[PDB]
Amino acid sequence: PSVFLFPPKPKDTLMISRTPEVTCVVVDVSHEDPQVKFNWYVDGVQVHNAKTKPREQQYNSTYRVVSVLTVLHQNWLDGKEYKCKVSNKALPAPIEKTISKAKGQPREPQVYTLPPSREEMTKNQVSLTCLVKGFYPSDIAVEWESNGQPENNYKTTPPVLDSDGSFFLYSKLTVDKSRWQQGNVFSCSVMHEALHNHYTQKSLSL
């Protein structure tokens, strides 16, 4: 019988337009007593329910009850400590787990655009590169767009811990060498808290 707390997507917390949420996943809940009682304390407060919501889920022969808590963007951003107290009669002591964003002065992520190297132009598809470096915390999202429209064929490394104490990563957009050669312009959208409006956009084009 175990509890697992998860923080919200970096993106979810950096855009007021969307709803961030912290989940309290509970594993190995036997059938001989599946009733699980959740409790959420935001920075020590709120024994009394607020905005929570869980639901059932059957698995390997065990259970996975999941309670969700809707967070306030600034709350999370201002390092509030979220706690989830899980209770089960199959447990002597309730399970308490806390979660808050990483601690430490935030750092503006430098964003760059790297075009397909010469040697790669001998293929039918080329890779556009966006180097996102020097940012802290690790919370971050990256996207690509051409003429104001999304792009699907791309992938982004998870963040990597650099030398100073900042992180970095690369997002690779792959598109037919023609499009790139047809002069089209693409753009890497980066969303980080330490950024102005939590969003900066960098363009790429031959």
Ligand X SMILES: *[C@@H]1O[C@H](CO[C@H]2O[C@@H](C)[C@@H](O)[C@@H](O)[C@@H]2O)[C@@H](O[C@@H]2O[C@H](CO)[C@@H](O[C@@H]3O[C@H](CO[C@H]4O[C@H](CO)[C@@H](O)[C@H](O)[C@@H]4O[C@@H]4O[C@H](CO)[C@@H](O[C@@H]5O[C@H](CO)[C@H](O)[C@H](O)[C@H]5O)[C@H](O)[C@H]4NC(C)=O)[C@@H](O)[C@H](O[C@H]4O[C@H](CO)[C@@H](O)[C@H](O)[C@@H]4O)[C@@H]3O)[C@H](O)[C@H]2NC(C)=O)[C@H](O)[C@H]1NC(C)=O
Ligand Y SMILES: *[C@H]1O[C@H](CO[C@H]2O[C@@H](C)[C@@H](O)[C@@H](O)[C@@H]2O)[C@@H](O[C@@H]2O[C@H](CO)[C@@H](O[C@@H]3O[C@H](CO[C@@H]4O[C@H](CO)[C@@H](O)[C@H](O)[C@@H]4O[C@@H]4O[C@H](CO)[C@@H](O[C@@H]5O[C@H](CO)[C@H](O)[C@H](O)[C@H]5O)[C@H](O)[C@H]4NC(C)=O)[C@@H](O)[C@H](O[C@H]4O[C@H](CO)[C@@H](O)[C@H](O)[C@@H]4O)[C@@H]3O)[C@H](O)[C@H]2NC(C)=O)[C@H](O)[C@H]1NC(C)=O
Binding partner at 162 among ligand X, ligand Y, its own copies, none, C-beta below 5 to 8 Å by kind: its own copies
Q: State which residue, 59 or 112, has the beta carbon closest to ligand Y.
A: 59
Quote the CA–CA distance of 131 and 114 in Å, as a whole number: 7
Whole-number minimum distance, CB 120 to ligand X, in Å? 33
Tokens of 151: 């792009």
- Distance, in Å, from the CA atom of 119 to the CA atom of 48, rounded to the nearest integer, reads 62
CB of residue 147 to ligand X, shortest distance in Å: 30
- Residue 97 interacts with its own copies (CB under 8 A): yes or no: no
Region near its own copies per CB under 8 A, out of 62-70, 94-102, 119-127, 191-199: 119-127
Contact call for residue 21 and ligand Y (CB under 6 A): yes
Q: Is 110 in the site for its own copies (CB under 8 A)?
A: yes
* CA–CA separation, 15 and 31 (whole Å): 40
Q: Using the structure block, give the residue that is written with the tokens 């022969």.
A: 61
End-to-end CA distance of the chain: 56
Residue with Cβ nearer ligand X (23 or 174) = 23
Q: Are 50 and 40 in contact (CB under 8 A)?
A: yes
Contact 157, 99 (CB under 8 A): no
Distance from C-alpha of 77 to C-alpha of 23, rounded to nearest angstrom: 17
Interaction between residue 109 and ligand Y (CB under 6 A): no
| Residue 191's binding partner out of its own copies, ligand X, ligand Y, none, with CB under 5 to 8 Å set by partner kind | none
Residues 40 to 79 in contact with ligand Y, rule: CB under 6 A: 59-60, 62, 64
